[PDB]
């Protein structure tokens, strides 16, 4: 269980720890991937701006995953948000992409 | 009155309704197959279809 | 007396055994100002029991 409560009147929204506490959207987190697969639309709609700008880091546990490699010229600016957001949108309850 | 009823037959009509409510629950539940779950909401659970 | 009607004893239900349904009466205010509509599970078309 991880139930998200919004913060009224400027308070930060909070998600429930396994121990029972409720933390703001900061720090280092550990998910299992089935958690994210349960309600991925609500989860990424809550988490997109916090991953993109805030100091939120999430460790999602798999064990196994197939991967895909994209290369960039290191002497040129390169941002990976289009690819990362594409993966986090194309994930679904029944499957994952690479 | 269409919208009215005599209060002196409430017990008789309610227990006749209980009789019909019992007589419509005289059936047996029939086995209708299962399917192993593939989405991780319930791990390893078999759901009746 | 010579040949009577037989009753239908065995009857089988393939659905689910219940008699008490749950019905909504007044709709919840899903567009409201104090809470944004991104809270509710009705906005994402998540069906609920």
């Amino acid at each position: 269980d991880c139930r998200i409560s919004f913060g009224m009147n400027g308070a930060a929204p909070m998600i429930r720890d396994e121990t029972g506490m409720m933390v703001p959207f900061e720090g280092n987190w550990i998910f299992p991937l089935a958690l994210w697969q349960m309600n991925t639309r609500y989860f990424n709609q809550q988490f997109d701006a916090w991953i993109k700008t805030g100091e939120l880091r999430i460790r999602i546990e798999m064990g196994a995953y197939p991967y895909m490699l994209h290369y960039y010229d290191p002497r040129q600016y390169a941002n990976a948000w289009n690819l990362t957001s594409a993966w986090l949108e194309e994930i679904t309850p029944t499957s994952i992409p690479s | 009155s269409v919208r009215g009823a005599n209060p002196l037959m409430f017990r008789a009509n309610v227990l006749h309704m209980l009789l019909e409510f019992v007589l419509d629950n005289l059936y047996l539940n029939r086995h209708t197959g299962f399917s192993q779950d593939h989405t991780p909401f319930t791990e390893g659970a078999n759901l009746r279809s | 007396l010579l040949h009577a009607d037989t009753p239908r004893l065995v009857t089988w239900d393939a659905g689910l055994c219940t008699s008490f349904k749950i019905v909504p009466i007044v709709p919840a205010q899903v567009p409201q100002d104090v809470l944004a509509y991104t809270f509710f599970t009705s906005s994402y078309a998540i069906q609920s029991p």
């Binding site: 709609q45 309850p93 | - | 906005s43 998540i46």
Partner: peptide
């Protein structure tokens, strides 16, 4: 058939984008 039963039991729980 089992393919339609599995597809139905996983198409019961989906979710779409908000408007």
């Amino acid at each position: 058939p089992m393919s339609t039963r599995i597809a139905e039991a996983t198409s019961a729980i989906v979710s779409k984008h908000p408007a």
